Write a protein that binds this ligand. Structure first.
Ligand code: NA
Ligand code: NA
Lengths: 307, 307, 307, 307, 307
């Protein structure tokens, strides 16, 4: 095969969309291989810019196509340089930009720890005609700098693997496996905004719904529970544009569900307390002892849910 | 005709839009036919990449156009390989991406069972000049993996049919029918998020509206019913961005309508109960027996609506 | 002139945007005229596909440009076939897709009856050098099938007219009028979703605002009227993303205005009833007789507004 | 210089975005100058269509570039005709579409009177090599027809001026000033929808907040004022998607601010009235005389704000 | 190297998106260098327009590529002029438009003071083959004019620096550092709309939550605090589309948090006041002295938060 070396530079990572589970990466790509020696004007290396490289392509120069596997839509490419050293090596420098997608788990919403994946693979040649030797990723711009709500940590891990595509086996008998470069950038979500925007106001609404039991009569605390129901519905709205639809439950949605359960349990408990009077003579305080036991059990439920 | 074999590979299915009734599919398409034997440099097959295939097209090579019938907009094509074996067969490999639309019924919203359809058809040649022999679809990437809220099950069924277009009969006398490939991927919606987001809170609001009848006087339970009306209006909003406009009623909208009917029936029943006093001496408890009969009838209504 | 025949096929009509007053139409266009006899390889007709037709255009072939007058943006064209019979006729087949706009009246919102208009006109030649003979529109796909909330009825009416453009009269002395094809598809809005989403809940809120008059004291029914005011404001929001800004009033906005008028009339009537006491001794029941007259007058107002 | 005459035809003006302060204009542009006499096939004028004009451009024909100065993004051009009379004049007909921006003042929101501006200017040649002689604008399609909420009045005024660009003075010593065509279409906003959607419901909320003073005790009218506060907050939302952020205040936002001021002034006045009792014996009616003076002063404030 | 002079003209700055932290800049770019003397038709300088410059590029003319480093997506370029003086200098004039991004700090939201940065850098040549001599930026259009909510002050500062890219060091041994032009436009946010839209209504809600303590009994002031809680939740929504997610807290979000803290502190204080009665005989006024001390402490907290 023809040995190809890749050097991916990353300019910035921006536009992290946690709802669509995509992110947008800017930077440059530098491929480099070795071919037959050629003649260039003078000892200086030759530069071929964009919209004129096609003359060299039709002239007979072997130039591979690099595509990104996990991209959404076409990569919005810009400039492309094909510079030619006269000793033989051909360097293809291009600027890439596109929306990349990943699995992006959400088992813990506010304290999330994710990774950003770039997968690079030639479109045409299998690994017996183009093998990737190595990649060095220079993430010097975003090495320890904070992007939106994400605090990037560590270097970018590199890997080379041989992926196999079975759909090409109808036309290629044996040699139909492709060279993979995957580039991983670990990213940890910064939980501060969520900490002072959702989990603390929801806990305070939980305490306000706890404080229903301190009342003295029926209709006043039913109206208190109903106007607490309305504001729990209000916080049920604000999470609709913060995470997508998930099969499981995150921290915030479990807290919403716990709030609904606590308020309707309080309403059912007060309804049962009023229903305890068979003839309208019995006082209702014996079941009203959960002023100092419902918060303890709810705290225990939260403590179990933490671990 | 010229026999053409298709092998569609599917990379991922993403961006399922249940409101616009479209979905976006990434993957590759591999067409293959057989032509006259040709001379290639060496015994190796020849590779022609993108933006240089037009030289072979103007040079005189017969290369069909594959279009997707059910696509929204132009398919955002990327790379395209035309590789040439020297024995005669010509292989057209291309990467396709676009928004496909389907009928996408919504008789049951949270427990939906849909399918994803890809329809492939040549743009120019009728079946007497291009007949599709077979298709093998390799859905190995999404075979049993979960995409957003959709849990994909089974393989992808394949079919070949001859569709007929009457609009072309003005220029072609008899032979004006086209070759169809349809590819079907069955998909079942995962009902968990809806189960703990809409149907359970709405049932709890239904029980809260049931609990109006336990009060003792007029204005307190009218205010209770009105503040329950307000939060049913609040849940009437949250469904406005979850399904499109439908002629029929789904489960969730029938539950909204049932909630409105139950609350206004309670208000009318209490209004009638107060209106029962002709001279202000009659007690109002005889019609107030629906504390243990309105939930039973409402449960029966729900049970009828289930089947 | 050169006689041109058009056969427009319509694949589907989708993405009906009632706010922007545009709609998106997919399908094919087939133009056909007659020219000088030519020589083709063999007795079979010649096929010229996309991205190679420009060789025949620069070679000297007369091929008109068909544009859509009422389009928003450029029509997102795809494939284009120029097939050549050897007897002389030249057929230009193209696939068109774009957002078309129309007047789209809204005098009755839920029971709307609209039409979809496609206007076709050559860009360059006036009717003395290109005259449209006839059009046959094959709307076989959407002939009696329901698209989103629109139930399409009937065939598509056809017309040929000669439109005149005065702006071209500065450069052409007399012959400056163009050939028009307009294609009309009548469409009736299906009122079911609106019937069980807006007009019925609003009428029930109207009845709830009627039920204010059954109370016995002041502040309780003022609070009842205010919490009904809040939910009428809540329904004033839901119509903000269903129709655009109109100079006139539809059914639903007239019902909103009637709800505001009824609630504030009830508040003013109760304020006047309390203000009737000059010295705090007079009872307030004489003006409170509108329990059985305000619904009758409001029903009469609705009955007048219907016709 | 070379004298150029322009005839701009306007098809429709649509998509008026009052938030982004842009609007979208469809129509055609017709440039015309005079050059050397040429030979054409026959006495008929020659027509050159799109995607073949570049042969005449590379062949040596002088064809200027017309750009729109106030455009947002590139103008989405479509067809372009370059027709050649054999006497010498060369006519460049093109179809233009793009988002144009203007200052778009908002001192009076519902009774706005704006204008739509098209600025046309050559990209390359200064006025000593291309001078615009005149423009005639044919606004016959939208001459007295209503677009969305805008009622277009009058003709379109025309102007020719010589704009000067200082940034080009580094490379051109003296002659560096360009020819301007500005085309102005006056447009008056139709205030009906706003009249029955915002200013009337807000005045009715103002009257409802006036009616707090008719109560007899404390907590009932505090709760009345608070539930009026909530619905004034509700109307504070609906204006967030109707106008952009402005440094000044429009009519509707001044009415919101007046509503907040009136409600909190009522709350402070009632708080002061309750605080007037030093020992709990004094009656609170002397300061409660603003039942018939607060509306008069508020009407006077509105009357001052009108002029 | 080849000395290049740049003159950037700025037409307007529009579409400032404070959520995505990007802004869109229109204007022109004028590059200029000096090459070998050439022959042109006549003594006049030669003009080469768009879509014909590629003939001169393939003909052998050295023309650099100018890219913007901090751009989001490809710059939506339009026309491009390459004018040739016959003495030797070659001028490349182009029109640029794109979304540029910057750090855009938000430590003070309503009284923000930001800057707009344009970074220009050649794509291919390092500073030993293309060195930027100077830039003069002509910001004459937006010199002291107000764009949306931003009041632009001062001139645009200019700078030339030599940036170094390590990712290119794999292919270039020593000389791998690029020439930077950065152009800075200082911009101050106009705080008026925020002043009368958020900070004043929130302070008035704060005073309304202060006025809870003037009541006489329990359930009335609990209901007052709960209906104030609901409208603080309502203002918690309106800030969700005004700034993005930030790790820190701005002025408005600190005011929201202070409002939540004050209301729940009032609820806890009243709960403690009711809980002070061990046997139901003690009066609750001793802890109710914060009618004139809670506003003072809250004002002190605000005063500390200001500096
Ligand atoms: Na909303
Ligand atoms: Na009460």
């Amino acid at each position: 095969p023809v040995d190809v070396s890749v050097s991916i530079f990353i300019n910035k990572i921006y536009g992290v969309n946690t709802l669509e589970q995509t992110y947008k990466v800017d930077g440059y790509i530098v491929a480099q291989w070795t071919g037959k020696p050629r003649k260039t004007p003078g000892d200086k290396p030759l530069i071929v810019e964009n919209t004129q490289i096609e003359r060299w392509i039709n002239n007979g120069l072997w130039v591979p196509a690099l595509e990104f596997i996990n991209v959404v839509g076409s990569p919005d490419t810009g400039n492309k340089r094909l510079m030619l050293f006269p000793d033989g090596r051909v360097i293809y420098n291009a600027r890439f930009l596109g929306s990349f997608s990943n699995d992006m788990d959400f088992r813990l919403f506010p304290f999330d720890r994710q990774q950003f994946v770039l997968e690079l693979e030639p479109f045409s040649y299998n690994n017996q005609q183009l093998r990737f030797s190595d990649i060095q990723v220079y993430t010097e711009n975003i090495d320890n700098e904070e992007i939106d709500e994400w605090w990037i940590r560590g270097k970018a891990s590199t890997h080379i693997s041989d992926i196999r595509y079975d759909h090409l086996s109808s036309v290629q008998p044996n040699q139909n496996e492709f060279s993979r470069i995957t580039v991983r950038i670990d990213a940890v979500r910064n939980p501060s905004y969520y900490l002072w925007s959702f989990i603390l106001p929801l806990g305070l609404i939980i305490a306000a719904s706890w404080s229903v039991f301190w009342l003295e009569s029926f209709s006043e605390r039913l109206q208190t529970s109903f106007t607490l129901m309305l504001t729990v519905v209000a916080y049920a709205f604000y999470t609709s544009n913060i995470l997508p639809r998930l099969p499981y439950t995150t921290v915030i949605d479990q807290m919403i569900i716990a709030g609904y359960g606590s308020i309707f349990a309080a309403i059912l408990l007060i309804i049962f307390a009023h229903h305890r009077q068979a003839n309208g003579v019995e006082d209702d305080l014996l079941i009203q002892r959960c002023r100092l036991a419902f918060p303890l059990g709810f705290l225990a439920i939260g403590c179990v849910l933490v671990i």
